[PDB]
PDB file of C-alpha atoms in Angstrom:
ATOM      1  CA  UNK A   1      -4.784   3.802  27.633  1.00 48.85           C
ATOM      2  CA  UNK A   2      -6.548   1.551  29.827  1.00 48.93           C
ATOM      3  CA  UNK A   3     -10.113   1.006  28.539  1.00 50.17           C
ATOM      4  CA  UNK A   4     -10.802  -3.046  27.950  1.00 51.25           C
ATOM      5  CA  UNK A   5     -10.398  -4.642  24.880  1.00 52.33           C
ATOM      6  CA  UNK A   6      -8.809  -1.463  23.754  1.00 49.51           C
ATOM      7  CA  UNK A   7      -5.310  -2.063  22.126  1.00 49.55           C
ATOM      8  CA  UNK A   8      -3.048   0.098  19.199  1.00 54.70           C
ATOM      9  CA  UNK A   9      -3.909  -1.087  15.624  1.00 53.01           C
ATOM     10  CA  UNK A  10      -0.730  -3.215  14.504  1.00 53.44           C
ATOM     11  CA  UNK A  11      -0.036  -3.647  10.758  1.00 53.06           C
ATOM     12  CA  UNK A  12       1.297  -5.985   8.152  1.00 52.90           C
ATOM     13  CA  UNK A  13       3.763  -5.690   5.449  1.00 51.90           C
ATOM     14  CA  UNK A  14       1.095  -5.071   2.280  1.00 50.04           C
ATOM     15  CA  UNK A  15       2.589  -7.175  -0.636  1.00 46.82           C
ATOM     16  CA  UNK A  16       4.806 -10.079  -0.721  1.00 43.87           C
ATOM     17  CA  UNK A  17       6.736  -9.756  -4.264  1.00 44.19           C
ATOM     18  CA  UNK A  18       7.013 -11.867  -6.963  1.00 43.47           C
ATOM     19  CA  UNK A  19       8.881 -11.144  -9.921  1.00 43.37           C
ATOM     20  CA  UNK A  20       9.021 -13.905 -12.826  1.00 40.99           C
ATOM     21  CA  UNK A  21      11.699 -14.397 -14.821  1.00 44.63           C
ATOM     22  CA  UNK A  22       9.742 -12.767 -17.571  1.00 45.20           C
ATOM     23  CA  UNK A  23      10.001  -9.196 -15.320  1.00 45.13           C
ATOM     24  CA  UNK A  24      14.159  -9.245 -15.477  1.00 46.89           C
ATOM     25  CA  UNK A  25      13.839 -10.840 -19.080  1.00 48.03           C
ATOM     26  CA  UNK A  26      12.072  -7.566 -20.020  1.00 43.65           C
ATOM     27  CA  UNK A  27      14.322  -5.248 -17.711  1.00 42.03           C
ATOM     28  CA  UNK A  28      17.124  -6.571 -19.605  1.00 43.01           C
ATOM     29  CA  UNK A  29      15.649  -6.322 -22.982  1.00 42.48           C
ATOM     30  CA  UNK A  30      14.531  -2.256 -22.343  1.00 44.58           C
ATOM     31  CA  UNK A  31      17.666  -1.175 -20.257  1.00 46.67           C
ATOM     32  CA  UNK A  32      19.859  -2.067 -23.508  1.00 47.11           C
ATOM     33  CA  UNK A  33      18.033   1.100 -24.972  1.00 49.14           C
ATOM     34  CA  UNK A  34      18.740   3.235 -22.196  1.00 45.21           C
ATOM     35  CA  UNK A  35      22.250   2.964 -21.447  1.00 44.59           C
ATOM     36  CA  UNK A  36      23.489   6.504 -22.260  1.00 40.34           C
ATOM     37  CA  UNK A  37      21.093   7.306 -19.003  1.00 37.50           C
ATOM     38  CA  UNK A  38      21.807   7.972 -15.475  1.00 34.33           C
ATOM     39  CA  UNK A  39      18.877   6.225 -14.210  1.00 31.71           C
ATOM     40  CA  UNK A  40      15.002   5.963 -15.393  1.00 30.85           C
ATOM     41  CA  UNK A  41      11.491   5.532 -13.494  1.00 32.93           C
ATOM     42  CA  UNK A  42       9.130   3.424 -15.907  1.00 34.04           C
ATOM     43  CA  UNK A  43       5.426   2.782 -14.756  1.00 35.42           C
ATOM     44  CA  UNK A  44       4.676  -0.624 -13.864  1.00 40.45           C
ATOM     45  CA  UNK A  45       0.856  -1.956 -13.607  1.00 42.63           C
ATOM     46  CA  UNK A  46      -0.356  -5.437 -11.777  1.00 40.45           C
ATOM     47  CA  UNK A  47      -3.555  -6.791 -11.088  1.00 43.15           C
ATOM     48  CA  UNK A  48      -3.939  -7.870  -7.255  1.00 40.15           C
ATOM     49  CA  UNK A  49      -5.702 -11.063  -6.680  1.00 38.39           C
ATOM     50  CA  UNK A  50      -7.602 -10.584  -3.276  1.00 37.32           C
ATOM     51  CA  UNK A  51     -10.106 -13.521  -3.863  1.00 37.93           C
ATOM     52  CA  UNK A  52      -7.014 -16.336  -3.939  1.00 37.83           C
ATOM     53  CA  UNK A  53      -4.470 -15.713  -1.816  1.00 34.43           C
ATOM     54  CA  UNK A  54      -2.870 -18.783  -0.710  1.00 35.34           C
ATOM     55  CA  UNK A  55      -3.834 -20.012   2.964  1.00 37.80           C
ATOM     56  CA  UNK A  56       0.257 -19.372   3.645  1.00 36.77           C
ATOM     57  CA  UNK A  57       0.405 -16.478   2.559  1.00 36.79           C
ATOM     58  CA  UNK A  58       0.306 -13.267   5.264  1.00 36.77           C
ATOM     59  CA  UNK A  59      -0.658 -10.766   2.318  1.00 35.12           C
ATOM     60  CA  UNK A  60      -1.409 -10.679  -1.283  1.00 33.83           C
ATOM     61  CA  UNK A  61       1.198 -11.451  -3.357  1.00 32.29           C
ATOM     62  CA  UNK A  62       2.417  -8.850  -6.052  1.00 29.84           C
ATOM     63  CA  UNK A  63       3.074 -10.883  -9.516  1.00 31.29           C
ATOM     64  CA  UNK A  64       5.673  -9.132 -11.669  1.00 31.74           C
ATOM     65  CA  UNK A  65       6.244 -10.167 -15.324  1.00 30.34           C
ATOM     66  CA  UNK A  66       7.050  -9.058 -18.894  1.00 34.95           C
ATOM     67  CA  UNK A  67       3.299  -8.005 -19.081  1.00 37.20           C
ATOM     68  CA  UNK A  68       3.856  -5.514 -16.146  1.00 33.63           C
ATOM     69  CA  UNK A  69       5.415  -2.899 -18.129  1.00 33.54           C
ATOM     70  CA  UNK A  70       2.736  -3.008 -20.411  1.00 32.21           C
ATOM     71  CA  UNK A  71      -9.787 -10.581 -14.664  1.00 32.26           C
ATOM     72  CA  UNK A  72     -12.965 -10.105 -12.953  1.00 33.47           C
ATOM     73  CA  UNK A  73     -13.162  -8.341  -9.885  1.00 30.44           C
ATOM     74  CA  UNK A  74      -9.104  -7.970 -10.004  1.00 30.98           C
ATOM     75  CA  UNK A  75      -7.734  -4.965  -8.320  1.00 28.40           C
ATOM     76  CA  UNK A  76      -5.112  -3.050 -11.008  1.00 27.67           C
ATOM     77  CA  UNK A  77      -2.205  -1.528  -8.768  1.00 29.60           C
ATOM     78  CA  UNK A  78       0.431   1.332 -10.154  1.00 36.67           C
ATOM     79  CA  UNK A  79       3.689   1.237  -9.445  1.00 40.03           C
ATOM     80  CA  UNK A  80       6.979   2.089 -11.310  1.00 40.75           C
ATOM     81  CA  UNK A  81      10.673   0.342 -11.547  1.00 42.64           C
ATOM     82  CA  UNK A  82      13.631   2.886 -10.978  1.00 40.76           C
ATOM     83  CA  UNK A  83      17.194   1.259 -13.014  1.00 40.60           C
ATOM     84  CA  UNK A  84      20.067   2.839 -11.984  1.00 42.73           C
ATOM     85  CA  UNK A  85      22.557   2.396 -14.749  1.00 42.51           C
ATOM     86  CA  UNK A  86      25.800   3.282 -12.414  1.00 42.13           C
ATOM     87  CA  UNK A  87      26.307   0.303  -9.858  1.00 44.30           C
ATOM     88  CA  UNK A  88      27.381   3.354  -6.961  1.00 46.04           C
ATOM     89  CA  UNK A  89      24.452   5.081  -7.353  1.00 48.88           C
ATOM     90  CA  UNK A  90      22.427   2.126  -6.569  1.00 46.15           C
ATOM     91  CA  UNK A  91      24.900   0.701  -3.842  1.00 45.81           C
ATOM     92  CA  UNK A  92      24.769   4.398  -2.007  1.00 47.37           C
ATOM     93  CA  UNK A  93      20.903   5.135  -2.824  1.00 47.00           C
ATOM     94  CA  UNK A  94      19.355   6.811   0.908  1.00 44.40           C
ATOM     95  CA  UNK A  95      16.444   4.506   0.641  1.00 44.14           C
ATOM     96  CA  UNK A  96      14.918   6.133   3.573  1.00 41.96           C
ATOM     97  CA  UNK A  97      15.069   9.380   1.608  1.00 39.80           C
ATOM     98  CA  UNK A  98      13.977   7.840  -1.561  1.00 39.94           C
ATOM     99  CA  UNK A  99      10.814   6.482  -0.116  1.00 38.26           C
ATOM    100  CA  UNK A 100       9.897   8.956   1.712  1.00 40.51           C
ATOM    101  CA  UNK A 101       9.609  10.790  -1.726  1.00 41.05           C
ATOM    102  CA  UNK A 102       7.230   8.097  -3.091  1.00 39.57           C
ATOM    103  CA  UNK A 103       5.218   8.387  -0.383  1.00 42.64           C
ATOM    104  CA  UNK A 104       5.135  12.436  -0.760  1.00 42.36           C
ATOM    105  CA  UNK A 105       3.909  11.738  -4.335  1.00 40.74           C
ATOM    106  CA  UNK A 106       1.158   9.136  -2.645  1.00 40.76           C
ATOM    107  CA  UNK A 107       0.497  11.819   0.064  1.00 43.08           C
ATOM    108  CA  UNK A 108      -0.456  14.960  -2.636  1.00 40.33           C
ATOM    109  CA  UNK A 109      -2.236  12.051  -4.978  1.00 40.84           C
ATOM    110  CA  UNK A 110      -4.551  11.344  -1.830  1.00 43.30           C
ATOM    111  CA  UNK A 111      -5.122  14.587  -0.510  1.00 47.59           C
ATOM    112  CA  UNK A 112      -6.955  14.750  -3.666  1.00 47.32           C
ATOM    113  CA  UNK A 113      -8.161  11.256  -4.103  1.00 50.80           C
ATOM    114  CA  UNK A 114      -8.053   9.018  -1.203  1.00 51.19           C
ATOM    115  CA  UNK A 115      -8.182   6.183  -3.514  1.00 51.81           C
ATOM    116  CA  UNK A 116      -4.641   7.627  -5.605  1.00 50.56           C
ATOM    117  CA  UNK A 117      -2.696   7.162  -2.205  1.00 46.78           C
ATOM    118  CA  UNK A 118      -0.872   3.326  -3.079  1.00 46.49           C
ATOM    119  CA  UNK A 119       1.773   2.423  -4.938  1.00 45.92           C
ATOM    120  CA  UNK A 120       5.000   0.216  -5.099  1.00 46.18           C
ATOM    121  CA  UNK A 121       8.232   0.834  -6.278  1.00 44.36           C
ATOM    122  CA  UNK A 122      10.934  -1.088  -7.583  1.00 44.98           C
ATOM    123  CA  UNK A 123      14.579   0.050  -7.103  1.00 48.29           C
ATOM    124  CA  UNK A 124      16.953  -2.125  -9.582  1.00 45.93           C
ATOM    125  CA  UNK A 125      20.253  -2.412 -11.031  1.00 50.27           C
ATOM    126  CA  UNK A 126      21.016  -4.599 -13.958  1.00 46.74           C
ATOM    127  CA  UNK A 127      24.302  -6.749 -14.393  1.00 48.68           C
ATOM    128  CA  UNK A 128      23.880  -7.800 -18.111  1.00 46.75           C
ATOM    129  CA  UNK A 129      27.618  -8.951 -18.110  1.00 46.58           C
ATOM    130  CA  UNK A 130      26.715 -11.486 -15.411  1.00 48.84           C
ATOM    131  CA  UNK A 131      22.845 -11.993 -15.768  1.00 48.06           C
ATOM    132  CA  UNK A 132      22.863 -10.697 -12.191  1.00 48.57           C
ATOM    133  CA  UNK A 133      20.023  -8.330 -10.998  1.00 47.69           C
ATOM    134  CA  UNK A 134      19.454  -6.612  -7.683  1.00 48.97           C
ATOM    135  CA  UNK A 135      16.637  -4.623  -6.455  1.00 43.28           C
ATOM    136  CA  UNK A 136      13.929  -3.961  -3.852  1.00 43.22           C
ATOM    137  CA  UNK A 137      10.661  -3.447  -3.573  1.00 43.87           C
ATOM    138  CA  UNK A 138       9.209  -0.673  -1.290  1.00 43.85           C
ATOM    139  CA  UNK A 139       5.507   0.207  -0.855  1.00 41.68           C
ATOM    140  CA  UNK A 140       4.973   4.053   0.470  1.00 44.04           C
ATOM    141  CA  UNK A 141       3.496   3.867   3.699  1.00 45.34           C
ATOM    142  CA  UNK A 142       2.772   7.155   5.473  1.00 47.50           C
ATOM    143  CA  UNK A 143       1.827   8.239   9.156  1.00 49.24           C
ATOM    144  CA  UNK A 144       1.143  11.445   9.454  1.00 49.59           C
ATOM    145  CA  UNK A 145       1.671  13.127  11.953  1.00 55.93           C
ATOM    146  CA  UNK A 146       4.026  10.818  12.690  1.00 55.90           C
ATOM    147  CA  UNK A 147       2.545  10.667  16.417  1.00 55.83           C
ATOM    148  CA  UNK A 148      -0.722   9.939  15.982  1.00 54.72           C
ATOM    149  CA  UNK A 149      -1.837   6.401  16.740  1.00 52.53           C
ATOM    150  CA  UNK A 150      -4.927   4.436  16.369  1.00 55.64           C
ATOM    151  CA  UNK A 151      -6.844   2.409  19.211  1.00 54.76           C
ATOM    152  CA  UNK A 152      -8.833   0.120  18.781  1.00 53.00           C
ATOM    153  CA  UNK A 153     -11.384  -2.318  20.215  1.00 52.26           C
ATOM    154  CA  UNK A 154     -13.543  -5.058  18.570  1.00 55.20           C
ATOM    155  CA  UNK A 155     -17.229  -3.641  17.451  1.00 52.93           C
ATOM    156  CA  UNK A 156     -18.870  -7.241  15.933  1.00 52.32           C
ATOM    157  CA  UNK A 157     -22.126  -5.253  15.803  1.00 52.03           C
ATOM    158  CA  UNK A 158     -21.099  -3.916  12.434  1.00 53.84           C
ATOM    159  CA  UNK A 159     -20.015  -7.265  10.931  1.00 54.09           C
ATOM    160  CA  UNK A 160     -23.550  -7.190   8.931  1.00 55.42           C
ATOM    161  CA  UNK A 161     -21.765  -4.573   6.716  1.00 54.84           C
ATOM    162  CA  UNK A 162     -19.343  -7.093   5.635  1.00 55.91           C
ATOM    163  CA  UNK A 163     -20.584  -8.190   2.524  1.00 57.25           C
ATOM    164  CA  UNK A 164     -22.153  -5.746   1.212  1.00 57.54           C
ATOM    165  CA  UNK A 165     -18.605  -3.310   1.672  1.00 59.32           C
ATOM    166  CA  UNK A 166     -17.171  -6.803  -0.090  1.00 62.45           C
ATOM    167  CA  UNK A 167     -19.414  -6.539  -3.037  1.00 57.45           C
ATOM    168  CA  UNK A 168     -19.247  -3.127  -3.363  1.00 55.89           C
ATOM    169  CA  UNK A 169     -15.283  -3.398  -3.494  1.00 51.60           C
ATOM    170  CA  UNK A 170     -15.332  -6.070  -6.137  1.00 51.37           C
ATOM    171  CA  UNK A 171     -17.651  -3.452  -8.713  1.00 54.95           C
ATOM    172  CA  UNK A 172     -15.400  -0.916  -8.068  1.00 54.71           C
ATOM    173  CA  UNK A 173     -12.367  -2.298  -8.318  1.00 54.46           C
ATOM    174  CA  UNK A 174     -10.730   1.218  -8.785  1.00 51.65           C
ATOM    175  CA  UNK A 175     -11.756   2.084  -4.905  1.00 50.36           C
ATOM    176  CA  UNK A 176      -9.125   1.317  -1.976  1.00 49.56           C
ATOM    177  CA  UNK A 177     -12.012   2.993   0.272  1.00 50.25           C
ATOM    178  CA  UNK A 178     -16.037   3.541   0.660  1.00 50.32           C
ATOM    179  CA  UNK A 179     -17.896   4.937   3.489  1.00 48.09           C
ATOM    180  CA  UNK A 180     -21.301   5.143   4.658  1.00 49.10           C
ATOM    181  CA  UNK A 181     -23.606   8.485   3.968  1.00 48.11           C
ATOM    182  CA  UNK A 182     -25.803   9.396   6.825  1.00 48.08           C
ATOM    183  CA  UNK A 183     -28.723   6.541   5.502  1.00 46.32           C
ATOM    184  CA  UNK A 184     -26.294   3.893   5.984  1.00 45.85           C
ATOM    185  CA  UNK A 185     -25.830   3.375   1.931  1.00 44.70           C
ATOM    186  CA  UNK A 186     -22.530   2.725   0.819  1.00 49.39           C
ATOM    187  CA  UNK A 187     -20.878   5.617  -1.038  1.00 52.85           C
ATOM    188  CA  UNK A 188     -17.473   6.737  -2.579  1.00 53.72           C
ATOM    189  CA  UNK A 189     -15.091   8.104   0.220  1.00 54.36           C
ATOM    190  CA  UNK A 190     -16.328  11.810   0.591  1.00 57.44           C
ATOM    191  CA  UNK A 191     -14.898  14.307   3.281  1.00 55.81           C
ATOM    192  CA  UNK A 192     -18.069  16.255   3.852  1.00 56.61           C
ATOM    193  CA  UNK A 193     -19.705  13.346   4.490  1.00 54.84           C
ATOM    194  CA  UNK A 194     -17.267  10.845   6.431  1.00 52.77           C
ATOM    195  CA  UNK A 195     -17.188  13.873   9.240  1.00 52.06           C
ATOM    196  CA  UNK A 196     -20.883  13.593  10.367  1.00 51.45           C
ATOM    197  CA  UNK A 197     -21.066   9.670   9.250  1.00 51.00           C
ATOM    198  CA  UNK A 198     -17.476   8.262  10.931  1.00 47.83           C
ATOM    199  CA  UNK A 199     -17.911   5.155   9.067  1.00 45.01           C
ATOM    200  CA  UNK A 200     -14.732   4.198   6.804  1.00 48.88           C
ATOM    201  CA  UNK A 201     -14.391   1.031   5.236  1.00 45.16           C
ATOM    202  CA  UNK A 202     -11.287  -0.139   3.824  1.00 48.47           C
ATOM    203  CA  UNK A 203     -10.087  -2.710   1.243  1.00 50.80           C
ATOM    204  CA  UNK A 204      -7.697  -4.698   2.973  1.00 46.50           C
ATOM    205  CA  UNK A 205      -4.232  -6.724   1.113  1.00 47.41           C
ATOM    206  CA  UNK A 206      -3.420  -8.753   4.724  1.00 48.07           C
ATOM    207  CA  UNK A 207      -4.569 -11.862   5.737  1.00 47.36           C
ATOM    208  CA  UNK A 208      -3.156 -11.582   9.295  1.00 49.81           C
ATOM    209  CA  UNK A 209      -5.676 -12.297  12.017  1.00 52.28           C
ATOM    210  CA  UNK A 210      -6.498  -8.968  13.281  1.00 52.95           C
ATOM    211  CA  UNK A 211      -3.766  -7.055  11.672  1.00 52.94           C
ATOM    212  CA  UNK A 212      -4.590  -5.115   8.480  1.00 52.96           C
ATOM    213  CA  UNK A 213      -2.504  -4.061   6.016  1.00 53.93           C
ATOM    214  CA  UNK A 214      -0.247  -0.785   6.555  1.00 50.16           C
ATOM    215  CA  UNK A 215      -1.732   0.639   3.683  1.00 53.54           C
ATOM    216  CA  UNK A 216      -4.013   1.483   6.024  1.00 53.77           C
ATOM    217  CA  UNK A 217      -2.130   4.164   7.610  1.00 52.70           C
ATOM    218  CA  UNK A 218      -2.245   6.002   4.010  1.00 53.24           C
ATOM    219  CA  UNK A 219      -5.688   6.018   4.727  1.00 57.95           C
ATOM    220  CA  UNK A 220      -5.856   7.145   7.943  1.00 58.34           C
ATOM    221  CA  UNK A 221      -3.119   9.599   7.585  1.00 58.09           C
ATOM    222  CA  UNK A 222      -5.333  11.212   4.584  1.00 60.06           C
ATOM    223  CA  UNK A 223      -8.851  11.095   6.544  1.00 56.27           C
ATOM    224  CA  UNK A 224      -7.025  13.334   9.697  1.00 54.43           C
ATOM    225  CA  UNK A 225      -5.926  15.910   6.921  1.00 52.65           C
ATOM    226  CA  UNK A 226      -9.749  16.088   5.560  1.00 48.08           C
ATOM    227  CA  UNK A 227     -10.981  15.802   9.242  1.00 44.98           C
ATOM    228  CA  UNK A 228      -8.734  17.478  11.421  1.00 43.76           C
ATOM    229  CA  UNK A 229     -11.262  17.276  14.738  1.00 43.31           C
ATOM    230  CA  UNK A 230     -12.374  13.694  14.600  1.00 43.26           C
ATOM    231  CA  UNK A 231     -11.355  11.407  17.153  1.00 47.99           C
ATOM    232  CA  UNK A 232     -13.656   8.439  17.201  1.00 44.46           C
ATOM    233  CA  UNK A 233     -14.900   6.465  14.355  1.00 46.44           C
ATOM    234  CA  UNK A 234     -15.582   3.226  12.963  1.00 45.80           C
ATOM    235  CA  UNK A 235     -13.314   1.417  11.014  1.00 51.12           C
ATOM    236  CA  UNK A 236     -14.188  -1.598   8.775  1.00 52.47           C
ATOM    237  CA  UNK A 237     -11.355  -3.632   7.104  1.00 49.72           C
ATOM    238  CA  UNK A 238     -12.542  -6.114   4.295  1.00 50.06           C
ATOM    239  CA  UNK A 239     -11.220  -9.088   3.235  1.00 49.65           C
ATOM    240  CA  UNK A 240     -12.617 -10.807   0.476  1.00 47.48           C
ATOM    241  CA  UNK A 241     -12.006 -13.980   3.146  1.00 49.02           C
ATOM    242  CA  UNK A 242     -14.229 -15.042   6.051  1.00 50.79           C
ATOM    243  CA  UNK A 243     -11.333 -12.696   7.776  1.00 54.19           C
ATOM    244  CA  UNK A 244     -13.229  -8.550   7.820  1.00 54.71           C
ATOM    245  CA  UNK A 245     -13.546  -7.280  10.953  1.00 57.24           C
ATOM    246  CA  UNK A 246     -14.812  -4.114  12.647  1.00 58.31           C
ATOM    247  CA  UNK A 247     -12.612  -1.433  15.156  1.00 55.53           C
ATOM    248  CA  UNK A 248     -14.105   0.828  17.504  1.00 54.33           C
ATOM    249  CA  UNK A 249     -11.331   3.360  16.636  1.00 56.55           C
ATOM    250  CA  UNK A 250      -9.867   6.490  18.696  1.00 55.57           C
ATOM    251  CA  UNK A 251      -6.972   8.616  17.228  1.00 59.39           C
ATOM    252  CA  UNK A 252      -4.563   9.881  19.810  1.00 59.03           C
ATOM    253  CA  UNK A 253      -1.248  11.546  20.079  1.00 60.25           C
ATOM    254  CA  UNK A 254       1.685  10.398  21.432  1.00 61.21           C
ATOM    255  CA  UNK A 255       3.164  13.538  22.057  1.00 62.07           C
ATOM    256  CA  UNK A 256       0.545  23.053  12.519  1.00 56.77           C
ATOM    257  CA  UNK A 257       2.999  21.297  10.554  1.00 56.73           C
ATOM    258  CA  UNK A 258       3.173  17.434  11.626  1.00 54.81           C
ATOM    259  CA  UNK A 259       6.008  14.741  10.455  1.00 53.31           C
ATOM    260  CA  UNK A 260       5.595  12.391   7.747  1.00 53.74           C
ATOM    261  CA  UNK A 261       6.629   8.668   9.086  1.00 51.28           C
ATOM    262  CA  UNK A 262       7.591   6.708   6.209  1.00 50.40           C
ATOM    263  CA  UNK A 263       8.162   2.906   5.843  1.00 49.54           C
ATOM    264  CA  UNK A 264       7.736  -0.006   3.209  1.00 47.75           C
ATOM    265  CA  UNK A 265      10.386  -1.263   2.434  1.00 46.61           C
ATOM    266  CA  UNK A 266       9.929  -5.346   1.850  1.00 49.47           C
ATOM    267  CA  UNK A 267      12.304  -7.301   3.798  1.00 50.44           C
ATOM    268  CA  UNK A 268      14.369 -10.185   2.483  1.00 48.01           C
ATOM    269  CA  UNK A 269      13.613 -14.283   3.121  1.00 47.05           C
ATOM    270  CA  UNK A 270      15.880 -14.119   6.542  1.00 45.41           C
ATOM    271  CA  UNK A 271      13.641 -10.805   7.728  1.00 46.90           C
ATOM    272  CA  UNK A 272      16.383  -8.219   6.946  1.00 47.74           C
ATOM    273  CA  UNK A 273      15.895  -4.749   5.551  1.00 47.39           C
ATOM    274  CA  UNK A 274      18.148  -5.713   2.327  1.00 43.50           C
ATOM    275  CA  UNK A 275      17.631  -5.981  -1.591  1.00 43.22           C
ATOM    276  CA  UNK A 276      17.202  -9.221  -3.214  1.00 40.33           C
ATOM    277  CA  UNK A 277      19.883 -10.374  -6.333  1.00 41.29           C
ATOM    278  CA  UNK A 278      18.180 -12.831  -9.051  1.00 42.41           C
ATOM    279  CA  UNK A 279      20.996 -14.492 -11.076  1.00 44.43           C
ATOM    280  CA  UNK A 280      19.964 -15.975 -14.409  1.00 43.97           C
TER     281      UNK A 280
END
C-alpha cells in the first residue's frame, strides 16, 4: 500500500521467561513420581505484572516458581509444562508441529471465548543424575489465514479512551479484550456487536514503542472468524504505561479453508531459536 502514515503492524515476542530455582526444584521433586511415564502435560498458573515492568524490559516478564504448579489488579495466565521422561523424545520433538497444536487448542478456546485464546507452554526434560534441566518456552501465536495482514496508521483522536480501557482492564483482570457498544460504553468483547461498533481494545504484554505484543494476532485472527466481512476498524492497544496507542487498522490479503501461521517460540540470550539448560 501506499496511503501515508500507513505501515504493517509489527509485533513483539509476548513474555520474557523467568523460571526460579524453586520451578526446577519442584520439577524435580514431582517427576520422581512419574517416572514409569512417557511424558506428562501439568497445568501451570502465573500472575502477570503489567503495572511494573522494568524500564529494560521489551515485555512482561513471566515468573516461574514452585508456587506455579499450584495481587491486585494482577493478570493470572494458564499455561502447562510438558516433561519428557526419554532424553530422544525431547532431543527429536517437531516443535513446529508441537506448537502449532497449542495454538489449535488456543484457536477452538477463542472461537468460543476470545479471552481463552493465550497460553504458554513449557517443553522440559529433567537430568536428575546431573541436576541438569533443559527446556523452552513457547507462547501459541496464531495468524489465520496465514495471509492476512494488518495496516495500520496512527489515530491519536482516540487516545481519550486510554484510561478508561486501562481501568476497565485492571477490574477485569480475567479479560485479554473489551470493545465499545454502539454508545461508546465499554463492554465485554461481543461479535454481534464489534461488527457495527469496529472498536477493539486490547490488553497489551509489550513495552516496545509502537509494537504490540503478538498475542495480538490471536486476537485478530479470532475477530476475522466472528467477522468475516470487516476490513477497517479501530484498534486500541493498552498499556498500563504512558505507552497505549491507537491504529487506524485495514485487514488485507497477501495473496474457504485458510492456513494457520504459528509461532512463539522464545529465543535464547544470543537470539537463537534454541532451548535453554539450567544446571544446579
Amino acid at each position: 500500500g501506499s496511503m501515508s502514515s500507513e505501515r504493517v503492524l509489527s509485533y513483539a515476542p509476548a513474555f520474557k521467561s523467568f523460571l526460579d530455582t524453586s520451578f526446577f526444584q519442584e520439577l524435580s521433586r514431582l517427576k520422581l513420581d512419574v517416572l514409569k511415564l512417557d511424558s506428562t502435560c501439568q497445568p501451570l498458573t502465573v500472575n502477570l505484572d503489567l503495572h511494573n515492568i522494568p524500564k529494560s524490559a521489551d515485555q512482561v516478564p513471566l515468573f516461574l516458581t514452585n508456587r506455579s504448579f499450584e495481587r491486585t489488579n494482577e493478570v493470572p495466565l494458564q499455561g502447562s509444562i510438558f516433561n519428557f521422561n526419554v532424553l530422544d523424545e525431547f532431543k527429536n520433538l517437531d516443535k513446529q508441529l508441537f506448537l502449532h497444536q497449542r495454538a489449535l487448542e488456543c484457536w477452538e478456546d477463542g472461537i468460543k471465548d476470545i479471552n481463552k485464546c493465550v497460553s504458554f507452554v513449557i517443553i522440559s526434560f529433567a537430568d536428575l543424575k546431573k541436576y541438569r534441566f533443559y527446556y523452552w518456552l513457547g507462547v501459541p501465536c496464531f495468524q489465520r489465514p496465514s495471509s492476512t495482514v494488518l495496516h495500520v496508521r496512527p489515530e491519536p483522536s482516540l487516545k481519550g479512551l486510554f484510561s478508561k480501557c486501562q481501568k476497565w482492564f485492571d477490574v477485569n483482570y480475567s479479560k485479554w479484550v473489551c470493545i465499545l457498544d454502539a454508545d461508546d460504553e465499554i463492554v465485554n468483547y461481543d461479535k454481534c456487536i464489534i461488527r457495527k461498533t469496529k472498536v477493539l481494545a486490547i490488553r497489551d504484554t509489550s513495552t516496545m514503542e509502537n509494537v504490540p505484543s503478538a498475542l495480538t494476532k490471536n486476537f485478530l485472527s479470532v475477530l476475522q472468524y466472528d467477522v468475516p466481512d470487516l476490513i477497517d476498524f479501530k484498534l486500541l492497544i493498552i498499556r498500563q504505561n504512558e505507552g497505549s496507542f491507537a491504529l487506524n487498522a485495514t485487514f488485507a490479503s497477501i495473496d474457504s479453508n485458510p492456513d494457520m501461521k504459528v509461532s512463539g517460540w522464545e529465543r535464547n540470550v544470543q537470539g537463537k531459536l534454541a532451548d535453554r539448560v539450567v544446571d544446579l
